[PDB]
């Protein structure tokens, strides 16, 4: 399920009912939400390992933060567009609609691990396991949705039970989700049933070989970069198609992943000339996105609207993103251009 | 048809979900068909150098602004005034506790941009006067029923003509297709389905401005020499937990705002205001007109606690224990009355 450009709005926050849905496996039954507070999470790799219920988690702390939830596959269509000859690429051909900015609320993982005496000596990763039932007999490593991120993320990770002021839906990973701000969608583990502080990455297929950045025709392997930190990115959201001659408000969303978006330039002529856009609305912090807008006075014609964001570390979107075989992490400014017909 | 939000339904994400947001109308709602063609909705702009009627489509060309505000009825907390009546004293109106309030993100065009595009306000303009889009009964005195409100023109730079709330087109319940939003001002001033915005030399003399929504003593009539319900005062309340908890660690949370000013700090007491501790803010700061979530991490023995919060704004205005009585029961902001009784077992 992919969001259309008109549906992002300009309120920063993406409506929960329009937020994209992506699952690697079939979803659990909705009955896991019957008793949200009774959902159990096994916490290990800490000094005092224990299973805690969501009711217990709710006693330990409270944190609220906005992040950009974006599939590593967002923009895959734009990689497929660059294929030539016999070159092939499988996977969902997302354009820009596998992304939203949402507000999570829950308990800091740091508060949970501290209540259990802190991480075990030598821990280097946070490893979260999805709560889906695995089919009996088969090697669960082949199907389990289990991801590892560096333990440097500990102070930012949230075990969230709420999003945009509502209890977390099944579609978005209720009753509890491991949120890793600034990291690609796959790392944000839905219906999280275990969190382990580990010395090594999980060897689950979804970590070891899937979700790796490699050349076309190469297999994924664990020496290659995983889809972890999200790169600087933006796109135009409005007007998504049309306007009338004269003043037009051009707007979109921009983010720096782990870093704040510092500035955004907008072009109406496919990147031949650029102008600085203004940020619109409140700043929800470095892991969220900003709305930006440029006022332009346009004659009747067909414009090519593009946006180019820079983060606080000086990372800037390229015109086109280097190819990788599975089509992860697109952040180019040319491919997501909006054709604006001005009447 | 009113809808009051339950304490359990505010959440701790700052933003109040649209489907939980309270509903209050002074008259019947217009039909759903006014949303069929949102972009064709017309707004008459007057009291400017070049007056004209603009459609929502035209308004959308002139600017873009996004801002969070606390939308709260002047009547929120009226129950707490009714609880203080003695003897023969009476007070009509909806007995809201704390649920006639939410924090929402609006998006639309700044009224300043609209006014600037039409050559600025006419010399001598003193008020911004918005007229609701409801149909009025034919041949009856429209002043008696029209939802028309005037606020000082000092609000010009803050006012938004909003077509969107919380990332979606504004619903009928919350004043689509276009709403005049007056940040920091009481709910009544945030005119739904706004069909006219006038920069006027005087307040409207519509009943709902002249004599309703005035602050007066019990047994007095409303009159235009009295303060109108305009700026909303510093306020907070506890939202969670709402009834029971287990002994041990308890996260006590709520919402706090300063109205025209940001909330700077919040104190929380678990013993009915005898002892206070400073709470922490939770989540991002959505600006001076929004509310903050706050929380206190408490460690509680078995017993019956009385949870209260006391907010201070950036200018040193602090909530009183009790709010001075007024006859229509507007603007309650006391910390004692909205206490949560928490049974810890
Ligand atoms: N448990 C789990 N979790 C999980 C999953 C699954 O399947 N399971 N998926 C992923 C992905 S992959 Mo690609 O990188 S994007 C993504 C995300 C999505 O989310 P939403 O649906 O809520 O939107 O999630 C995440 N998480
Ligand atoms: N047009 C119009 N608007 C309007 C109206 C009516 O009736 N009409 N109401 C008021 C009031 S009053 Mo007392 O101060 S509160 C209030 C508000 C509400 O909102 P929601 O329903 O959305 O919540 O609105 C406002 N606006």
XYZ file of C-alpha atoms and ligand atoms in Angstrom:
740
model
C 0.000 0.000 0.000
C 1.622 3.303 -1.250
C 0.772 6.964 -0.373
C -0.120 9.324 -3.314
C 1.591 12.778 -3.351
C -1.597 14.709 -2.774
C -2.138 12.658 0.416
C 0.989 13.734 2.363
C -0.593 17.044 3.324
C 1.400 20.019 4.592
C 0.946 19.464 8.365
C 4.301 17.591 8.633
C 2.628 14.582 10.242
C 1.383 11.887 7.895
C -2.168 10.762 8.649
C -2.023 7.290 10.169
C -4.762 5.994 7.848
C -2.747 7.104 4.756
C 0.662 5.846 5.962
C 2.141 3.150 3.707
C 2.098 -0.528 4.719
C 4.941 -2.965 4.010
C 5.311 -6.463 5.471
C 7.891 -9.147 4.735
C 5.561 -11.922 5.974
C 1.853 -12.343 6.771
C 0.611 -10.265 9.631
C -0.397 -11.677 13.016
C -4.074 -11.877 13.885
C -5.724 -8.729 15.204
C -6.311 -10.602 18.449
C -2.784 -9.685 19.582
C -4.426 -6.273 20.282
C -7.240 -7.646 22.498
C -5.038 -7.215 25.565
C -2.279 -4.764 24.584
C -1.056 -4.458 28.159
C -0.523 -8.262 28.404
C 1.823 -8.381 25.383
C 5.192 -9.820 26.462
C 8.678 -8.737 25.422
C 11.730 -10.813 26.312
C 14.693 -8.562 27.198
C 18.083 -10.267 27.076
C 21.756 -9.416 26.877
C 21.286 -7.341 30.004
C 22.564 -7.966 33.546
C 19.120 -9.153 34.760
C 17.239 -10.705 31.796
C 13.468 -10.748 32.193
C 10.245 -10.873 30.211
C 8.183 -7.691 30.713
C 4.596 -6.967 29.770
C 3.547 -3.731 28.046
C 1.791 -2.791 31.340
C 5.156 -3.075 33.068
C 6.915 -1.142 30.277
C 4.459 1.712 30.739
C 5.622 2.100 34.363
C 9.288 2.578 33.435
C 9.277 5.764 31.397
C 7.661 7.891 28.728
C 9.110 9.343 25.549
C 7.583 10.907 22.445
C 9.407 11.560 19.172
C 8.702 12.153 15.514
C 10.578 10.130 12.910
C 10.503 9.453 9.220
C 9.289 5.890 8.630
C 10.505 5.065 5.111
C 11.031 1.785 3.358
C 14.560 1.130 2.056
C 12.690 0.371 -1.197
C 11.158 3.859 -1.509
C 12.315 5.115 -4.935
C 12.984 1.649 -6.338
C 11.010 2.575 -9.511
C 13.683 5.176 -10.220
C 16.443 2.538 -10.166
C 14.380 0.272 -12.455
C 14.069 3.240 -14.866
C 17.897 3.250 -15.190
C 18.188 -0.444 -16.167
C 19.415 -1.126 -19.728
C 19.505 -4.122 -22.045
C 18.983 -7.406 -20.200
C 19.363 -5.909 -16.678
C 16.563 -6.868 -14.279
C 15.455 -5.852 -10.751
C 12.718 -7.468 -8.689
C 10.765 -5.834 -5.862
C 8.047 -3.289 -5.305
C 8.459 -0.308 -7.680
C 7.772 2.402 -5.067
C 8.137 6.012 -6.188
C 7.976 8.338 -3.131
C 4.926 6.941 -1.311
C 6.646 4.432 1.019
C 7.388 7.141 3.619
C 5.664 9.127 6.322
C 6.529 11.308 9.285
C 4.783 10.211 12.450
C 4.920 10.822 16.178
C 5.615 7.780 18.314
C 5.071 7.455 22.034
C 6.300 4.751 24.375
C 9.167 3.871 26.690
C 12.855 4.580 25.962
C 14.722 1.326 25.457
C 17.461 2.855 27.599
C 15.016 2.958 30.560
C 14.076 -0.685 30.026
C 17.696 -1.944 29.856
C 18.670 0.267 32.860
C 15.837 -1.211 34.961
C 17.406 -4.612 34.211
C 20.936 -3.544 35.264
C 22.168 -2.296 31.894
C 23.557 -4.125 28.843
C 25.832 -7.078 29.344
C 29.563 -6.370 29.049
C 30.615 -6.423 25.408
C 27.200 -5.752 23.798
C 27.563 -4.042 20.375
C 24.046 -4.361 18.821
C 20.357 -3.996 19.577
C 18.570 -6.958 18.039
C 14.755 -6.934 17.821
C 12.552 -9.882 16.876
C 9.122 -9.572 15.271
C 6.182 -11.370 16.891
C 4.899 -13.262 13.833
C 4.266 -17.002 14.198
C 6.803 -18.935 12.146
C 5.666 -22.041 10.198
C 6.641 -25.256 11.982
C 9.443 -27.548 10.750
C 11.261 -24.927 8.617
C 14.427 -23.072 9.562
C 13.083 -19.939 11.308
C 16.264 -18.009 10.273
C 14.901 -18.009 6.725
C 11.674 -16.170 7.584
C 11.952 -14.399 10.962
C 11.819 -10.604 10.849
C 14.768 -9.935 13.163
C 17.138 -6.990 12.702
C 20.246 -5.692 14.419
C 21.382 -2.080 14.693
C 24.450 -0.617 16.398
C 24.174 -0.154 20.160
C 25.093 3.561 19.688
C 21.327 3.884 18.944
C 20.327 2.773 22.458
C 19.528 6.295 23.749
C 17.188 6.965 20.790
C 15.332 3.644 20.437
C 11.658 3.643 21.560
C 9.424 0.684 22.380
C 6.292 2.408 21.112
C 2.674 1.553 21.929
C 1.155 4.675 20.352
C 1.464 6.640 17.119
C -0.118 10.019 16.278
C -2.044 9.952 19.553
C -3.765 6.570 18.896
C -2.918 3.052 20.140
C -0.703 1.442 17.512
C -2.726 -0.349 14.824
C -1.973 -3.887 13.640
C -1.062 -2.414 10.254
C 1.657 -0.339 11.941
C 2.888 -2.912 14.365
C 0.827 -2.835 17.518
C 0.764 -3.567 20.321
C 4.444 -2.643 20.604
C 7.028 -1.631 17.998
C 10.788 -1.115 18.155
C 11.414 2.306 16.656
C 14.967 3.186 15.577
C 15.040 6.924 14.685
C 16.949 7.810 11.538
C 17.139 4.197 10.293
C 15.430 2.557 7.332
C 11.942 1.051 7.728
C 13.039 -2.581 7.962
C 14.784 -1.888 11.296
C 11.556 -0.633 12.897
C 10.381 -4.034 14.118
C 6.594 -4.470 14.372
C 4.942 -6.489 17.171
C 8.316 -6.763 18.838
C 8.469 -9.811 21.133
C 12.156 -9.743 22.011
C 14.934 -7.201 22.297
C 18.465 -8.472 22.885
C 21.727 -6.595 23.414
C 24.061 -8.765 21.320
C 27.791 -8.915 20.539
C 27.048 -9.832 16.902
C 24.339 -9.151 14.347
C 21.576 -11.672 14.020
C 22.261 -14.305 11.330
C 18.628 -14.234 10.264
C 18.398 -14.089 6.468
C 16.672 -10.710 6.578
C 19.845 -9.312 8.235
C 22.634 -11.456 6.806
C 21.844 -11.429 3.065
C 18.701 -9.374 2.474
C 18.665 -5.587 2.806
C 22.315 -5.258 1.718
C 23.749 -2.669 -0.692
C 25.559 -4.337 -3.617
C 26.134 -4.075 -7.392
C 23.672 -5.322 -10.014
C 24.114 -9.069 -10.429
C 25.811 -9.502 -7.005
C 24.272 -11.517 -4.164
C 23.713 -9.828 -0.824
C 26.300 -10.730 1.828
C 27.174 -9.483 5.325
C 30.430 -7.725 4.332
C 28.278 -5.200 2.420
C 26.534 -2.188 3.985
C 23.138 -2.895 5.476
C 20.252 -0.439 5.016
C 20.732 1.328 8.316
C 21.038 5.143 8.462
C 18.748 6.924 5.927
C 20.398 9.375 3.528
C 19.456 13.033 3.023
C 16.317 13.196 0.877
C 13.376 15.279 -0.285
C 10.601 15.407 -2.822
C 7.938 17.788 -4.068
C 4.396 16.951 -2.920
C 2.306 19.861 -4.189
C 0.931 20.925 -6.506
C 1.000 17.265 -7.524
C -0.305 17.966 -11.025
C -1.813 21.372 -11.791
C -2.131 25.096 -11.196
C -3.162 28.399 -12.828
C -0.852 31.119 -14.197
C 0.503 33.506 -11.606
C 1.441 32.789 -7.991
C 1.836 29.118 -7.085
C 2.933 27.635 -3.751
C 5.319 24.730 -4.335
C 5.857 22.483 -1.326
C 7.370 19.185 -0.247
C 9.114 17.261 2.527
C 12.836 17.101 3.350
C 14.942 15.222 5.908
C 18.514 14.299 6.761
C 17.972 10.887 8.374
C 20.202 10.999 11.428
C 20.765 14.719 10.830
C 18.494 17.737 10.574
C 17.705 19.152 7.155
C 19.554 22.474 7.018
C 18.176 23.832 3.755
C 16.268 23.014 0.602
C 16.512 24.426 -2.907
C 13.625 24.189 -5.382
C 13.747 24.365 -9.187
C 10.748 24.672 -11.518
C 12.795 23.964 -14.652
C 14.209 20.509 -13.963
C 17.235 21.768 -12.066
C 18.574 24.394 -14.476
C 17.984 27.206 -11.949
C 17.435 26.886 -8.193
C 15.953 29.074 -5.492
C 16.064 28.660 -1.709
C 12.819 27.405 -0.164
C 11.498 28.250 3.321
C 10.649 25.787 6.066
C 6.939 25.605 6.939
C 5.604 24.568 10.366
C 7.341 23.495 13.563
C 10.668 21.669 13.744
C 9.986 18.164 15.164
C 13.697 17.368 15.499
C 16.500 15.788 13.574
C 14.821 12.453 12.837
C 11.615 14.032 11.437
C 11.049 15.794 8.133
C 10.410 19.461 7.477
C 7.802 20.827 5.132
C 9.334 23.380 2.769
C 7.751 25.810 0.345
C 8.702 28.158 -2.487
C 6.352 30.826 -3.830
C 6.819 31.184 -7.615
C 5.123 33.303 -10.283
C 4.650 31.069 -13.329
C 3.397 31.585 -16.860
C 1.169 29.065 -18.572
C 3.338 26.019 -19.362
C 4.518 22.604 -18.188
C 7.075 22.815 -15.360
C 9.418 20.206 -13.924
C 9.463 20.611 -10.149
C 12.471 19.235 -8.193
C 13.921 19.774 -4.724
C 17.456 19.381 -3.397
C 18.061 19.070 0.337
C 21.252 19.540 2.371
C 21.666 18.245 5.953
C 23.631 19.804 8.862
C 26.727 17.755 7.950
C 26.739 19.149 4.372
C 25.392 15.965 2.752
C 23.389 16.983 -0.314
C 21.142 14.927 -2.569
C 22.791 13.917 -5.846
C 21.005 14.269 -9.212
C 20.828 10.468 -9.488
C 21.722 7.807 -6.914
C 24.429 5.216 -7.687
C 22.818 1.919 -8.808
C 22.590 -0.967 -6.350
C 21.139 -4.311 -7.284
C 18.178 -4.518 -4.932
C 17.262 -0.844 -5.492
C 17.583 0.445 -1.918
C 18.077 3.981 -0.663
C 17.193 6.127 -3.694
C 17.704 9.829 -2.881
C 18.240 11.547 -6.223
C 16.519 14.804 -7.076
C 15.829 14.329 -10.814
C 13.796 11.129 -10.858
C 11.031 12.178 -8.399
C 10.287 15.393 -10.338
C 6.661 16.574 -10.478
C 5.234 17.627 -13.859
C 3.199 20.750 -13.122
C 0.721 21.864 -15.812
C -0.060 25.553 -15.326
C -3.207 26.642 -17.112
C -24.549 17.152 19.440
C -21.474 17.639 21.669
C -18.503 15.316 21.953
C -16.173 15.477 24.967
C -12.788 13.724 24.861
C -12.115 11.178 27.646
C -8.859 11.682 29.655
C -7.806 8.248 28.496
C -8.128 9.379 24.867
C -5.751 12.373 24.740
C -2.702 10.175 24.213
C 0.868 11.369 24.847
C 1.811 12.291 21.256
C 0.840 15.987 21.811
C -1.505 15.933 18.837
C -5.128 15.036 19.533
C -6.507 12.560 17.013
C -9.169 14.102 14.721
C -11.725 11.395 15.552
C -11.315 12.038 19.314
C -11.296 15.880 19.086
C -14.235 17.473 20.911
C -17.180 18.869 18.990
C -19.247 21.931 19.887
C -21.622 23.953 17.758
C -23.842 26.921 18.588
C -26.339 26.136 15.785
C -27.019 23.204 13.432
C -24.215 21.962 11.209
C -24.351 22.788 7.478
C -24.904 19.845 5.124
C -22.039 17.522 4.070
C -22.481 18.814 0.485
C -20.450 21.959 1.292
C -17.369 19.634 1.115
C -18.183 18.380 -2.406
C -16.252 21.266 -3.961
C -13.801 22.481 -1.298
C -11.765 24.577 -3.728
C -14.891 26.447 -4.930
C -15.874 27.615 -1.424
C -16.026 31.430 -1.450
C -14.820 33.857 1.200
C -15.690 37.541 1.048
C -12.728 39.640 2.197
C -13.606 43.233 3.174
C -12.158 46.139 5.104
C -9.115 45.980 2.853
C -8.019 48.419 0.168
C -9.185 46.145 -2.668
C -12.103 44.076 -1.355
C -13.123 40.911 -3.158
C -14.452 37.420 -2.875
C -11.782 34.700 -3.134
C -12.232 30.968 -3.535
C -10.279 28.434 -1.522
C -8.371 27.650 -4.761
C -7.322 31.311 -4.973
C -6.478 31.406 -1.244
C -4.162 28.445 -1.805
C -2.055 30.530 -4.235
C -1.318 33.294 -1.726
C 0.754 31.539 0.948
C 1.257 28.495 3.127
C 1.532 28.279 6.901
C 1.391 25.372 9.314
C 0.913 25.838 13.060
C -0.246 23.931 16.119
C -2.762 25.469 18.497
C -4.867 24.439 21.468
C -8.511 24.452 20.351
C -10.477 24.664 23.617
C -14.023 25.685 24.307
C -14.518 28.652 26.653
C -16.821 26.260 28.520
C -14.121 23.629 29.179
C -14.191 23.161 32.966
C -17.712 24.538 33.430
C -18.538 21.503 35.677
C -16.013 22.852 38.180
C -17.815 26.189 38.379
C -21.188 24.412 38.794
C -19.661 22.417 41.688
C -18.994 25.708 43.535
C -22.611 26.970 43.378
C -24.420 27.243 46.739
C -28.024 27.715 47.791
C -30.314 28.984 45.035
C -27.463 29.719 42.556
C -27.803 28.212 39.085
C -25.703 27.924 35.936
C -26.853 26.611 32.588
C -24.635 25.197 29.823
C -22.627 22.125 28.967
C -20.902 20.732 32.093
C -17.546 19.989 30.444
C -14.729 18.771 32.721
C -11.440 18.760 30.720
C -12.427 17.114 27.437
C -13.417 20.199 25.406
C -9.806 20.784 24.324
C -7.307 19.377 21.857
C -3.964 20.277 20.302
C -4.031 20.107 16.513
C -1.857 21.136 13.587
C -3.532 23.455 11.080
C -2.407 24.227 7.576
C -3.643 26.975 5.314
C -2.902 30.553 4.277
C -1.880 33.318 6.662
C -4.601 35.972 6.837
C -1.758 38.530 6.600
C -0.916 37.249 3.088
C -4.570 37.493 2.041
C -4.840 41.044 3.392
C -1.472 42.096 1.822
C -2.597 40.730 -1.565
C -5.701 42.929 -1.411
C -3.658 46.082 -0.589
C -3.631 45.837 3.206
C -6.287 46.716 5.778
C -8.376 49.842 5.323
C -7.226 52.799 7.347
C -8.819 52.619 10.793
C -9.492 48.863 10.894
C -9.412 47.593 14.486
C -10.862 44.044 14.400
C -10.848 40.846 12.423
C -14.488 39.724 12.065
C -15.275 36.234 10.776
C -18.702 34.995 9.717
C -19.735 31.344 9.835
C -21.175 29.736 6.744
C -24.365 28.313 8.257
C -27.681 29.128 6.555
C -29.868 31.474 8.684
C -33.703 31.341 8.901
C -35.184 33.534 6.139
C -36.703 36.870 7.296
C -35.699 36.507 10.968
C -33.215 38.881 12.633
C -29.862 37.344 11.608
C -28.049 38.988 14.568
C -29.804 36.618 16.954
C -28.325 33.444 15.470
C -25.342 34.184 13.228
C -22.028 32.738 14.403
C -19.916 35.840 13.821
C -16.975 36.822 16.045
C -14.559 39.743 16.240
C -11.031 39.636 17.633
C -8.485 42.485 17.856
C -6.592 43.189 14.628
C -3.352 42.726 16.628
C -3.978 39.021 15.860
C -3.505 39.539 12.117
C -0.054 37.964 11.853
C -1.233 34.795 13.668
C -4.611 34.148 12.024
C -4.792 31.250 9.535
C -7.519 30.457 7.032
C -7.094 26.690 7.339
C -8.220 24.004 4.855
C -6.333 21.183 6.588
C -5.962 19.785 10.074
C -3.534 17.016 11.144
C -2.544 16.357 7.537
C -6.024 15.856 6.104
C -8.733 18.017 4.620
C -10.831 19.605 7.348
C -13.937 17.561 8.173
C -17.434 19.023 8.510
C -17.287 18.386 12.273
C -14.217 20.657 12.550
C -15.257 23.333 10.097
C -14.347 22.355 6.568
C -13.863 23.464 3.926
C -12.192 26.505 5.517
C -11.828 27.681 9.120
C -10.615 30.965 10.621
C -8.049 29.921 13.249
C -7.120 32.449 15.939
C -4.137 31.038 17.859
C -4.279 31.458 21.621
C -7.938 32.490 21.623
C -10.921 30.562 22.932
C -12.805 28.099 20.739
C -15.743 30.339 19.892
C -13.405 32.680 17.958
C -12.206 29.900 15.635
C -14.988 30.286 13.072
C -15.946 27.098 11.195
C -16.879 27.160 7.476
C -15.852 30.768 7.316
C -17.586 32.645 4.450
C -16.483 36.202 5.222
C -13.511 37.869 6.915
C -13.812 41.624 7.447
C -11.306 44.071 8.876
C -13.783 46.191 10.845
C -13.681 49.417 12.887
C -16.020 47.885 15.495
C -16.939 44.461 16.830
C -19.878 42.711 15.242
C -23.074 43.405 17.208
C -24.326 39.873 16.585
C -25.714 38.467 19.828
C -22.948 35.858 20.054
C -20.380 38.756 20.284
C -22.317 41.526 22.005
C -23.904 39.737 24.963
C -22.946 36.043 24.781
C -19.436 34.870 25.620
C -18.869 37.672 28.136
C -17.246 37.377 31.563
C -19.624 38.639 34.281
C -20.745 37.857 37.841
C -23.417 35.306 38.729
C -26.850 36.842 38.165
C -25.539 39.536 35.776
C -26.472 39.777 32.108
C -23.764 39.740 29.461
C -22.920 43.152 27.964
C -20.259 44.601 25.674
C -18.436 46.565 28.410
C -17.389 43.200 29.909
C -14.357 41.158 28.789
C -15.109 38.829 25.906
C -13.722 35.282 25.957
C -10.675 36.017 23.854
C -7.160 35.049 25.063
C -7.202 31.726 26.922
C -5.310 31.534 30.232
C -2.474 29.296 31.407
C -3.832 25.806 32.081
C -3.017 22.133 32.540
C -4.519 18.847 33.676
C -3.423 15.302 34.382
C -4.484 12.749 31.758
C -2.870 9.478 32.908
C -3.200 7.331 34.870
C -6.899 8.127 35.246
C -8.309 5.783 37.951
C -6.054 2.975 39.280
C -2.425 1.814 39.308
C -0.169 -0.747 40.961
C 2.133 0.227 43.785
C 5.627 1.037 42.611
C 6.690 3.212 39.696
C 3.945 5.225 37.987
C 4.300 7.670 35.091
C 1.999 10.592 35.715
C 1.402 12.668 32.606
C -0.738 15.458 31.245
C -0.982 18.464 28.988
C -0.060 22.122 29.694
C -0.301 25.397 27.756
C -0.021 29.127 28.269
C -2.619 30.252 25.717
C -0.924 33.176 23.999
C 2.412 32.122 25.547
C 4.303 28.822 25.747
C 4.166 26.734 28.906
C 7.623 27.129 30.560
C 7.295 24.639 33.403
C 4.896 22.309 35.169
C 4.772 21.119 38.789
C 2.949 17.915 39.742
C 1.592 16.911 43.176
C 0.306 13.492 44.172
C -1.074 14.646 47.571
C -3.587 17.252 46.400
C -1.151 20.152 46.277
C 0.577 19.858 49.659
C 3.883 18.784 48.081
C 5.028 19.614 44.497
C 7.764 18.278 42.199
C 8.900 19.619 38.830
C 7.755 17.560 35.824
C 9.684 17.024 32.575
C 8.413 17.926 29.125
C 7.741 14.986 26.815
C 8.049 15.236 23.028
C 8.762 18.143 20.688
C 7.836 21.776 21.258
C 5.142 22.731 18.705
C 5.359 26.416 19.628
C 3.835 29.088 21.734
C 0.166 28.337 21.052
C 0.398 24.523 21.389
C 0.388 22.394 24.495
C 3.277 20.350 25.873
C 2.977 16.872 27.291
C 4.579 16.647 30.734
C 5.391 13.708 32.970
C 6.529 12.937 36.488
C 8.075 9.584 37.283
C 6.633 8.705 40.713
C 7.161 5.771 43.112
C 3.972 5.278 45.084
C 2.839 3.114 47.987
C -0.610 1.615 48.277
C -3.065 4.454 48.989
C -5.437 7.000 47.460
C -3.628 9.817 45.710
C -4.920 13.180 44.484
C -3.029 14.084 41.320
C -2.827 17.744 40.279
C -0.653 19.825 37.945
C 0.243 23.524 38.076
C 1.555 25.199 34.934
C 3.542 28.408 34.544
C 3.878 30.245 31.208
C 6.936 32.053 29.819
C 5.743 35.356 31.332
C 5.342 33.997 34.899
C 1.562 33.506 34.807
C 0.715 30.494 36.967
C -2.550 28.587 37.370
C -4.485 29.486 40.520
C -5.878 26.860 42.862
C -9.418 27.953 41.996
C -10.716 30.236 39.246
C -12.844 33.266 40.197
C -16.543 32.555 39.568
C -18.248 33.989 36.497
C -21.906 33.532 35.694
C -21.683 31.655 32.410
C -18.773 29.499 33.699
C -16.123 30.455 31.144
C -12.369 30.014 31.304
C -11.854 27.627 34.217
C -8.092 27.090 34.787
C -7.781 26.065 38.437
C -5.541 23.161 39.450
C -7.609 21.753 42.326
C -10.888 20.893 40.602
C -9.557 18.711 37.748
C -7.613 16.476 40.189
C -7.381 12.802 39.383
C -8.199 10.450 42.273
C -5.764 7.552 41.820
C -6.265 4.304 43.807
C -2.875 2.598 44.072
C -3.197 -1.071 45.044
N 7.757 -7.652 12.550
C 7.906 -7.024 11.376
N 8.348 -5.732 11.416
C 8.476 -5.039 10.259
C 8.195 -5.677 8.948
C 7.735 -7.089 9.016
O 7.505 -7.701 7.947
N 7.586 -7.655 10.228
N 8.444 -5.006 7.763
C 9.440 -3.930 7.879
C 9.659 -3.075 6.644
S 10.633 -3.703 5.391
Mo 11.157 -1.871 3.985
O 12.809 -1.226 4.440
S 9.516 -0.803 5.282
C 9.152 -1.825 6.581
C 8.311 -1.251 7.714
C 6.946 -0.770 7.215
O 6.168 -0.266 8.312
P 4.667 0.189 8.071
O 3.955 -0.960 7.397
O 4.124 0.542 9.439
O 4.757 1.432 7.163
O 8.041 -2.179 8.783
C 9.145 -3.028 9.079
N 8.927 -3.765 10.295
N -19.409 28.641 12.242
C -19.286 28.214 13.499
N -18.032 28.178 14.026
C -17.863 27.746 15.286
C -18.993 27.295 16.105
C -20.312 27.400 15.448
O -21.336 27.089 16.071
N -20.365 27.828 14.181
N -18.835 26.971 17.412
C -17.660 27.561 18.062
C -17.341 27.091 19.474
S -18.199 27.763 20.767
Mo -17.044 27.205 22.753
O -15.926 28.608 23.196
S -15.884 25.773 21.296
C -16.337 26.210 19.706
C -15.553 25.618 18.557
C -15.585 24.089 18.591
O -14.740 23.564 17.558
P -14.747 21.978 17.256
O -16.174 21.487 17.276
O -14.033 21.808 15.942
O -13.990 21.461 18.449
O -16.012 26.016 17.263
C -16.420 27.379 17.189
N -16.617 27.739 15.801
